[PDB]
Structures are given as C-alpha cells and as structure tokens.
Symmetry: D2
Subunit: 268 residues, 4 copies
Amino acid sequence: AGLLDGKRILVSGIITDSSIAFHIARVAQEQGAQLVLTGFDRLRLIQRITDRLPAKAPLLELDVQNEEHLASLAGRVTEAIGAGNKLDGVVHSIGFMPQTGMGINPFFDAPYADVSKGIHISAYSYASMAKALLPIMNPGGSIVGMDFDPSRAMPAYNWMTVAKSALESVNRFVAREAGKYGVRSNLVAAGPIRTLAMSAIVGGALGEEAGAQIQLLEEGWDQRAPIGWNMKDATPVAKTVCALLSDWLPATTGDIIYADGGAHTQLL
Amino acid sequence: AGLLDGKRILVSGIITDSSIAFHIARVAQEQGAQLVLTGFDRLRLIQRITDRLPAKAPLLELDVQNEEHLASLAGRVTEAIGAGNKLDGVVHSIGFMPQTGMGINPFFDAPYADVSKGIHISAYSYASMAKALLPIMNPGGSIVGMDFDPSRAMPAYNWMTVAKSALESVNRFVAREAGKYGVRSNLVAAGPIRTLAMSAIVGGALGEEAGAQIQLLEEGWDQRAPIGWNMKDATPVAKTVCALLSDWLPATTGDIIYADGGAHTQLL
Amino acid sequence: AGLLDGKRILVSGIITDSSIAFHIARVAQEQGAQLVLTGFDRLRLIQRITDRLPAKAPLLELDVQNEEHLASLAGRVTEAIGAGNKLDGVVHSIGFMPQTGMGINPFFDAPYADVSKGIHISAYSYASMAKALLPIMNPGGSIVGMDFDPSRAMPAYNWMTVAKSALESVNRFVAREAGKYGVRSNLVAAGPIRTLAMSAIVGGALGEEAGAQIQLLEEGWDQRAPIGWNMKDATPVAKTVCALLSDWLPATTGDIIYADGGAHTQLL
Amino acid sequence: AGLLDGKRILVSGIITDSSIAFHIARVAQEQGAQLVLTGFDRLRLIQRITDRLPAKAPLLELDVQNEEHLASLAGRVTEAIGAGNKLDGVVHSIGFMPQTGMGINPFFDAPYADVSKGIHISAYSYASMAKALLPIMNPGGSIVGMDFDPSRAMPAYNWMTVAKSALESVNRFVAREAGKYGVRSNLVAAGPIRTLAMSAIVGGALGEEAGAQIQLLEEGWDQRAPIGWNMKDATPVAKTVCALLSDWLPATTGDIIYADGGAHTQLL
Ligand SMILES: NC(=O)c1ccc[n+]([C@@H]2O[C@H](COP(=O)([O-])OP(=O)(O)OC[C@H]3O[C@@H](n4cnc5c(N)ncnc54)[C@H](O)[C@@H]3O)[C@@H](O)[C@H]2O)c1
Ligand SMILES: NC(=O)c1ccc[n+]([C@@H]2O[C@H](COP(=O)([O-])OP(=O)(O)OC[C@H]3O[C@@H](n4cnc5c(N)ncnc54)[C@H](O)[C@@H]3O)[C@@H](O)[C@H]2O)c1
Ligand SMILES: NC(=O)c1ccc[n+]([C@@H]2O[C@H](COP(=O)([O-])OP(=O)(O)OC[C@H]3O[C@@H](n4cnc5c(N)ncnc54)[C@H](O)[C@@H]3O)[C@@H](O)[C@H]2O)c1
Ligand SMILES: NC(=O)c1ccc[n+]([C@@H]2O[C@H](COP(=O)([O-])OP(=O)(O)OC[C@H]3O[C@@H](n4cnc5c(N)ncnc54)[C@H](O)[C@@H]3O)[C@@H](O)[C@H]2O)c1
Ligand SMILES: O=C(NCc1cccnc1)NC1CCN(c2ncccn2)CC1
Ligand SMILES: O=C(NCc1cccnc1)NC1CCN(c2ncccn2)CC1
Ligand SMILES: O=C(NCc1cccnc1)NC1CCN(c2ncccn2)CC1
Ligand SMILES: O=C(NCc1cccnc1)NC1CCN(c2ncccn2)CC1
C-alpha cells in the first residue's frame, strides 16, 4: 500500500552508495515501485552497489553521449519489463562538467570543447532521454530531473551553473512534448548534498580557493533555511522526487519544486 | 492506509459545495485525515453543506477580522480534538475583495477602506491564523494557503492581484516563525476554478466588460497548459494541497507550488 | 544641454538633507529640469532644507492619506507651473511603517491598524498620485517610484517588505492606466542607504536585536555586489531615477530597475 | 554634447541595414561616440552597408568560433584607436542557431552538433569577447549583450530559447570578472524585431507551421504592451543599449533591462 504501488519506474544516475539516485531508488522500492536501473561506464561497480537496494532490479547500460545506446533503449527496457507493459516514471539524475569548468581555473579559461561536453551530459540528455522513453510511457506518467538553483551566480560552480540554467529551459520544452502523451515533466532543485565528489572538492581536489568557497557556500543553506538543512541526509530529496512520481501532484508540469529547506526564499 | 492517515487537520473556507475548501476537505477525509472545520457568518448553511462530506466533522465559527474569535480559537480547537492532542495541519482557503476592487469600476476608483478590508481578509489573516494555531501544532506539521499567480498584471482581477502579491510576501515571513515549531508554510497557486462567485462574474455581476475579460482570461489557461486545464474540476487542486499536508514534501517551506496544468511556464 | 533639459518634474519625499528625494532633486536640477516639490507635515523644515538645492523650486503640501490634498493637487501644480503647461515627470519617494511593523516586536504582534497605515502610505499612494497627476501629464512622460527588493524574506524589515511586494504589484496596474496617456511607470529597487532613520535603527532605536540584524543585512550588499556598494552615497540611485525620467528608456514600463551594485544577481 | 560624447565603443553584429547592431551604431554616433566595428564572413557586404552610417568607422574581422581571431582582437583594436587609448564600451549583438534547432523539425530532432554550434555563437561568445576585451577597457566601462526573454517556453524558437537561458547565466558570471576592472555587464531583452531573417521565417522559410506560430507570437507583444510595440522600429531598442553604455545606470550589473513595451509585465 505504498505511494508508488504497482508503478514501473526507470532510475538513471547511480555510481556509488552516496549518489542521490541510490536514495531515490531505495525510497521508491520501499513505496512499492518496480524498478529498471541505468548505469554508465563502471557496470561491475554499479551492479555491486545496487545489490544493497531492498529489492533486485535489472541493470541496463546507458551512456547519454552514445547514439546507439539511446536508439536501442526503449527495446531493452521493454525486454526487461515484459512485452505489453509500459513505464509510469523516469528519473534523470545525471550530471558532469570537466574540472576546467568548475573552479580549477578562472571562468574565462574553460575551453568550449569542455563546456560543450558538460552541457551535452547535464542538459541536452534530459531531452534525449524523454525522446527515447516517451513512446513506452503510460498516460498519467511522470519524468523528473535533478537541478541546483542557478538564478544567481555563485563562486566555483561556474559553467555547471550555466548547464543548470540550460536544463531548466529544456524542461519547459520537454513538458510541451510530454503533454501529448499525458505525461508530466518537472525538476527537483535540491540543497547541497555531501556525495563522494562534493566531499573531495571540499577537501581541495579542485584547488584550495574552490574548496574554501564551496565549504562556505554549502554552510549558508542551513543558516538561511527556516527548517534547517542537513547536507549529509539525502532522504528529504528522495521523498520529494517520489512525490512528483506519484499521482498527488497531477496538475504540475514544466516546473521546479525546491527541496532546499526553504533557503531560496530567505535573504538572511 | 491513506496519504493523511491519523493526521488532525483544520480546514477553513467552506461556504458552498463549489468552494475549493469543500474539495480539499473531501479528499483529506478519503485519505484518512480527522478534520475540524471553520466557517464565517452563514453557519446554518455551512453545517447543511458539510453534512455531504464522507465523515462528520465539528464546525467552529471564525471571522478573521474578529480579535475575540482569534484569541479563543486554540482553546475551541483543543476542546473539539480533546486535551493532550495537537493539530498536524492547517488549510487557509479564505479570500475577499469588495466589488469596487475587482472591476465594477476602474482600478483608480477603489477607495482605500475597501482595499484595506480585502488585504485584511486575503493576506494579513494568513499571519493571524498561524499566530493563533502554531502553539497547538505538532513538529512535522504543515500550513497551506490558496494563491492565484500575481507576478503579472491582468484585466479585472485588479486589487485582488495586489492582495495575492501581499499574501506571497506574508507566506515567506510565516515560514520563518513556523520553522521554530518544526512546521512548514506554503501556498498552492491554482488555475481558475468555476465557483459560484466566478460563474456570476462571467455572467456579468461586475459589469459586461469585466465578465468578457474574465471569460477570455480563464480560456487562456487550457490553451497554454501542456497537460490542459479543466476549470470545472477542483480535484487536481485538492490533491496538491493534500501532497503539501503529507510527509512527502518535507524540505519545502516559504514556497509556492503551481497546480495550473503548467500554464505559467508557457508564453503561448 | 542636460539629460532633462526643458522637462517639468514633480518630486515628492524630501524631509531632510539625507532623503533619497533630496539627491534625486539635486541631480535633476543639475541636468536642466524645472521642479515642483511636495512635502508632508513639517513644511517649515522642508522649505529650509530645500533652500540648499542648486535652484529655487515651489513647495506644495501633500499628505497622501488626505483626500482633499489629492483632489486639489492637479490645480495647485498647474498654478505653480502656469496655465497651458503640463508635467513631463513624477517622482514618488514616500514610505512609512509604524515601529510595530518593523522589528520593535515580533512579526505576529503588529496590529492590522498599523500595517494598514503602512500599506496606505507606502503602496496605495503610488496609485493615488498617478490618478491625481496623469490628467496633467504630457505624452512621453514618466512616473518613477522607490522600491527595496522584497522577493525574499529578511530579518527586521518585516511588514515594510510586505508593503514593497504590494507596491511592485500596484506599479504593474499603474503602467496599464498610464499607457493610455503615453506615460511610462517604473520602480527603482535601491540598495540600502544610510538616511537619518536607517542610522537611528542601526544605533538601536527599534531594539538591539533589530539593529544588529539591519547592520549585518546592510553589510552583505557590498560583499555580494560585483562593483561594490557604498551605503553612504545616494548619487548612483539619483542618476538611475533621472535615466528613467529621460527619453533614453522609451520602451520600459510596469518594470523594476535595480540600482544595487548588482547584489541581487549573486548568491555569495 | 551627446549622451556618449568622447566614448570609444566596439560594436559587433552588423550584417544588413535591418540588423539591431546597425541601429545601435547609428544612435551611438548621433550621441558623439567614436566606434570600432566587427564583422563576420561577408566583409565586402558589411563595409558597403556601414558606409551608410553618419560617420566612417574602422571595420575588423571577427568570427567568434575562431581562436586566432579572439587572440589577436585586443591588439587589432589598439591599432585602430591608437596606442595609449582604451575602450569605454562593448556591444555583443551576435546570435545563430541552425534551422534544425528553430522549428524546421520537432524539438527532439535537433542533433547536438547543431545545438552546440548555436550555444557557442549565442552564449559562450559573450564570455569569449569579455575575456579578449576587458584588458583594454577603462574603469567605468560597460559591456552590453542582446537577449530575448526565455523565462517561459514558446512555439518554434525551440533551442534558441535554451541558448538565451544560457546567455543570461553567462552574463551573471561575466559581471563578477568585469567588476575587478570597474566595468558593468548587462543584457537588453528586446521585443520582436522584423529583421531580414525574421521576415523570411514569417514568410515560411522554416515551414508553414513555424511561420504561422512566429507571426501569432510576434502579434501578442503589441496587444500586451501598455505602451504598445512596433516590430518595424528598432530605435527604442538602440536608445536602451545607449542608456546602458552611458554613465546614467552606474549601479546596475549582471542584470537584464527589458525594452519590450512592458509586454513581459502583463498576462493579458
Ligand atoms: N550533490 C549535490 O549537491 C547536488 C545538488 C543538487 C543537484 N544535484 C544533481 O543531482 C544529479 C546527480 O548527482 P549526484 O550529486 O548524485 O552525483 P553522482 O556522481 O553520484 O551522480 C551523477 C551521475 O551522472 C552519471 N553520468 C555522467 N556522465 C554520464 C553519461 N555520459 N551518461 C550517463 N550517465 C552519466 C554518473 O555515472 C553518475 O551516476 C546531478 O544532475 C547533479 O547536478 C546534485
Ligand atoms: N476560484 C478560483 O478561480 C481561485 C483560484 C486560485 C485561488 N483561489 C483562492 O482560493 C481561496 C478560496 O476561494 P474559492 O474560490 O473557493 O471561493 P469561496 O467563496 O468558496 O471561498 C472563500 C471563503 O472565504 C471566506 N471568508 C470571507 N471573508 C471571511 C472572513 N472575514 N473570515 C473568515 N472567512 C471569510 C468565505 O466565507 C468563503 O468560505 C481564496 O483565497 C481564493 O482567492 C481561487
Ligand atoms: N533608505 C533606504 O535604505 C532605502 C532603500 C530603498 C528604497 N527606499 C525607499 O525610498 C523612499 C524614500 O525613503 P528615504 O529612505 O529617503 O527616507 P525619508 O524618511 O527621507 O523619506 C520618506 C518620505 O516619506 C514621507 N511621508 C511619510 N508619510 C507621508 C504621508 N502621509 N504623505 C506624504 N509623504 C509622506 C516623509 O515625509 C519622507 O519625506 C521610500 O519609499 C523608501 O522605502 C529606501
Ligand atoms: N530580431 C529579433 O526579434 C530579436 C529580438 C531580441 C534579441 N535579438 C538578438 O539580437 C542579436 C542580433 O540579431 P539581429 O536580430 O539583429 O539579427 P542579425 O542577423 O542582423 O544579427 C546577428 C549577427 O550575428 C553574427 N554572427 C553569426 N555567427 C557569427 C560568428 N560565428 N561570429 C561572429 N558573428 C557572428 C551575424 O554575422 C550577424 O551580424 C542576436 O543576439 C539576437 O538573438 C533579436
Ligand atoms: O551539481 C552538483 N553539486 C551541486 C552543488 C553546487 C554548489 C555547492 N554544493 C553543491 N554536483 C554535480 C555532480 C556530478 N558532476 C560531476 N561529477 C564528477 C565530476 C564532474 N562533474 C557535476 C556536478
Ligand atoms: O481569487 C479568486 N479567483 C481567481 C481568478 C482570477 C481571475 C480569473 N479567474 C479566477 N476568487 C476569489 C474568491 C473569494 N473572493 C470573493 N468572493 C466573493 C465576493 C468577493 N470576493 C475573492 C476572489
Ligand atoms: O525602506 C527603507 N529602508 C530599506 C532598507 C531595508 C533593510 C535594510 N536597509 C535598508 N526605509 C523606509 C524609510 C521610510 N519609512 C519610515 N521612516 C520613518 C519611520 C518609519 N518608516 C519606511 C522605511
Ligand atoms: O533571436 C532572434 N529573434 C527573436 C524572436 C523570437 C521569437 C519571435 N520573434 C523574434 N533572432 C536571432 C537572429 C540571429 N540568428 C540566426 N540568424 C540567421 C540564421 C539563424 N540564426 C538567431 C536568431
């Protein structure tokens, strides 16, 4: 009798046990959803990590920059869920920006080849995934992507902020296409989460200046948030994604839900 | 095993069977919530209307302009739910603007005494209700109010648009105070709903010009909405309010959720 | 050969030599404008203060809460500028909120009579002034009001923030009416300025807590602003108001121009 | 005694007599500015077109995708304005999106190679130009770029809307870097202008459906604008760019000024 009882949902973006997608997958399974998982490059690691989920789920390879992977995706998902069955939900939890684009060097020194790779994976792929999966989605379905509020500039995040501004625009166009299938498209703008990569940045992987800036930036959320913010807890973010995958927000599309403790609503 | 199983929720704003609050109350009861209702002026009518809800609920008198009604509210609610029990949710579904403020005459011709009455009932009362009820709310609780997107000016809505801009500001301050109690505060910005008063305006109760403008304004929503908009169906709005009252959006506060078919995200 | 050569402009809001309106008036006169000034309550003080402006200007009494003052305003201005002449510009630099509404006590403890007085003077009066003066304004004319960004909640500003949210909504409706006369209506959202009242608040006139919060709040602007922010210098704000009064922003109306050093565009 | 008397300004983006940059260049020269022009690919055509400007100006070749052109730009500008002299202003009026990205085919059918080329020219190049020219800019200087409001999705504009969302984000980061030189960075969001390319689209160059959608979209501006909108008149847009290049908006940076007749402030 869970929130997502009987729903078939595809979850992308698991790489480690600290991935936001790992927590989305765990909460969705606790709420009765039947999952299909997609992974990039390190498939042996991803299978070993996902063995720790409450229930066993099939794992499919998906590199969003690979045209062949995207062209065969719908057929591979149909084989995993069985003929005559369709998806009720899709979770995009994919992001990447080369070090040159995220504070290892000044904003002006990031080459366009690096920025373009980052925009392909972080923004264009949201449209790529919707194109591939909408023909195998049921009416009343839901597509959810992960965002980080880019309305104002900030230190070190640099070109990844630009990629998120592009993603928010892409989401509004995806909602127009998804609407024809009776499917909603929305993003969850989360507060900062201490994943393995974020902890490494704070530890100085992109230089001391960038590390100090990210640490101070992350600390501002708990101070501003009227209900506080715990960067070591991904469960409130996972619950918000599940709310959008459910039948309980049926009139919301092309939109952004903020799971940030209310920090974006307060100046100080 | 409903979305709101075991929750004690106060619902204000029922006047007829077409009130948005009537639909919020019905959905909340179908989802296992135990309600307390508040009504203004026509208590015999409200009792007769609420006899049609799935379950019987106690009805309390509340005029938000009456200081005595607000001062005794917490004690009257405690008597209705029993000593030692507290509320888990509060629904503000209250609004009013005199005819002079809503298109019966030009924008510049509305006297301040009329505008002030409208702002008292539609915006200040959101803070009044939170002040009265937060001392009897449990941690993890939720306060929800009804909004109509006022970010851009529009024909005929006139000073009620100004009252909604004030309400959105009030909501951000209420979230600061509610946070100290472990309580969230949010608004649902709904698309237009054909209540008795809205149908009367379309029928020309505020003059032909205002009626023609409101009819054309309301018709724009379904055209712009990627998933469409049915002004004769309040159920998607009621479901969204219940989503905010639940434990499934635990990191959202001082915010606005749009239940408008995605119309605010599209230009044409 | 100044920016405003030959223009007839009404400037409201002068009380002391630290008033934002005093600096707007000085810059407008240096740029060739012919002024008419309006003052409230302390007319002997205002005449003595305005004797320090580069040129002598007629001073008229205007209490925005007084219906008689507003009804006679157009006739009194016509007498001052001469029959057959009209205004090219209007500056609204009026604001007030009782101490109960600005941090001397908690947000929930401000009585509605006090909040209503504050909203009348700070927001409704923008519509009152436009109603009185549009019949004596030339096509190509400009109305400008003073704003303080209220999109996010902040400590101590409390109900004055709510009044500014209402003012921004009022400005969008005033633009609809002013457009029929070929007149623009806009607001300037300024960064914090150390006027006599603001210095007194920092000095603890509204209590130590409010003073400490306002001081820290004000200090954040210079840190966030890419070009910095000097709270002791009103000249950049006065120049921005003159830009809107000129013929150089002819396609901007119902809008907000930010003269805050770019602080609102940066998170940290 | 013009608005820009004695200022040295670089203007990019002239291709025909209908280019927005042609009108910016003409108004800047009428206001006393000394110009340097940059052109792409068709240099013989651009020289012939710019012979019609009020004053003769040097023309330099600049393809924003060419690393060599950008590396030599500052030296070539210094040679044109003379040693010991620096620029006071820079105008970015550059945009491009392949037909696949602007309605000749569905949104999902635009290949990433085409979208990436469009984002390089329309958004990344704003950062490229600032990097090349800031070392030869005077304190008090100004950088201005051209925008088209992308906050909401719209028919046919498709991936060019996504490119504008990226440009707005880039502008906020450019303001951080430019601030170190005492230079402002802002965008002008203009209403639709009937350039040669826009007239060809309305005439069906990108298919009948796209043409019909663009014509209806463009027609909405004049209806919504409180002061109206003339798509055949670029002079109000050129005046707004000159206002930002002047000393009259000295506290505005990382921002957007809307020269759209106030259309973005009104729903209907
Ligand atoms: N961590 C935070 O503070 C935070 C906050 C808000 C939003 N987000 C967003 O949440 C999402 C998930 O990030 P995360 O923080 O969990 O980090 P993560 O490293 O755990 O997840 C990112 C995922 O992207 C995948 N990926 C990269 N390139 C790919 C490609 N070519 N094809 C397919 N998959 C590819 C990686 O394999 C990985 O699984 C991202 O969109 C991120 O921007 C993160
Ligand atoms: N109908 C729409 O199109 C629409 C759309 C979005 C939001 N809303 C908002 O939803 C809310 C509910 O409105 P509705 O459309 O259901 O209409 P409604 O007439 O059914 O409800 C408004 C309620 O306000 C109550 N009220 C008025 N003055 C009061 C006072 N002094 N004290 C206490 N209660 C008082 C009335 O008794 C009534 O129950 C309002 O805030 C309205 O602005 C309506
Ligand atoms: N000082 C700041 O930090 C700051 C920043 C942004 C915006 N503002 C705004 O600028 C405007 C001017 O304020 P200021 O800071 O120069 O302070 P101020 O005290 O010098 O000016 C406010 C003016 O309002 C007038 N006023 C009050 N009640 C009135 C009434 N009933 N009728 C007519 N006039 C009345 C006062 O006489 C005074 O001249 C206000 O709208 C204020 O909110 C101030
Ligand atoms: N026309 C409108 O309705 C409208 C409205 C708002 C904003 N804009 C924006 O105004 C700007 C100017 O466009 P326009 O409408 O005057 O059209 P336009 O065709 O006259 O100008 C665009 C310019 O971009 C140049 N360009 C293209 N690729 C280039 C490259 N690789 N290197 C250098 N220059 C390159 C072209 O040569 C041309 O001069 C664009 O950013 C456009 O998006 C246009
Ligand atoms: O989006 C975020 N974090 C949000 C944030 C911003 C500021 C402060 N705290 C948190 N992280 C993603 C994670 C995936 N990516 C990545 N991972 C590995 C290598 C390269 N890139 C891109 C960045
Ligand atoms: O907020 C709305 N409607 C939203 C809307 C706007 C534009 C087009 N369609 C819908 N209605 C409320 C209802 C309660 N009020 C009221 N009721 C009775 C008498 C006076 N006022 C105030 C107005
Ligand atoms: O709007 C402002 N200041 C903006 C601000 C906000 C936060 C930090 N720094 C600056 N001041 C006005 C001034 C006129 N008013 C007033 N004056 C006298 C007595 C009562 N009220 C109302 C408030
Ligand atoms: O940005 C605009 N127009 C704004 C607009 C949007 C919707 C309705 N009316 C106007 N035009 C530019 C012009 C330069 N570009 C271009 N030119 C030639 C070939 C390819 N691309 C890119 C598009």
